[PDB]
Amino acid sequence: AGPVTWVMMIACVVVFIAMQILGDQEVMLWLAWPFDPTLKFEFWRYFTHALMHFSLMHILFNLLWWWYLGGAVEKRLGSGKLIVITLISALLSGYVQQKFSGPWFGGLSGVVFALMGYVWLRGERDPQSGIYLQRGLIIFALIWIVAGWFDSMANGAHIAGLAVGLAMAFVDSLNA
């Protein structure tokens, strides 16, 4: 449990608290993916969608997975690796979710699915990294995706994240 793991758990709790004081919609207006081309130069929105959660159980569920897996990446591969997985995965899972269903979505599961993808593949192709995902959880992960197809989930985020995490994990398991 290091600096980037906790800095992101604080950001999500801080933003969650603001959504309870200001209301979901008020925060959404400022942190969500650009809904209007004129807003395209509001840099933060490509990332900030990931900090917003809509219930306590989803914030809990998400931050816990972020702790288990994100903490594992930071501990073993360092803070710069977790930053880069987070920024790339948040941007691209955002970009895909926007095309599938438009800009009104939020949550850290985009990033979480890239973490589950990276930790699983990296731990199979470069075991020496010191990270791994149990098969009991690669079943939970896959059941989680498919239970979103048959139904309130951001399906584009789920699958774009996962893909990003396999891609990066693959590249990093050549450079090893």
């Binding site: 979901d24 959404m28 969608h49 990931a50 809509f54 989803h58 899972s93 979710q97 269903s101 009104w104 979505f105 939020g106 949550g107 850290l108 599961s109 985009g110 309130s152 989930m153 951001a154 399906n155 985020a157 789920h158 994240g161």
Partner: peptide, 4 residues
């Protein structure tokens, strides 16, 4: 809205 959808849950990511």
């Amino acid at each position: 809205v959808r849950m990511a």
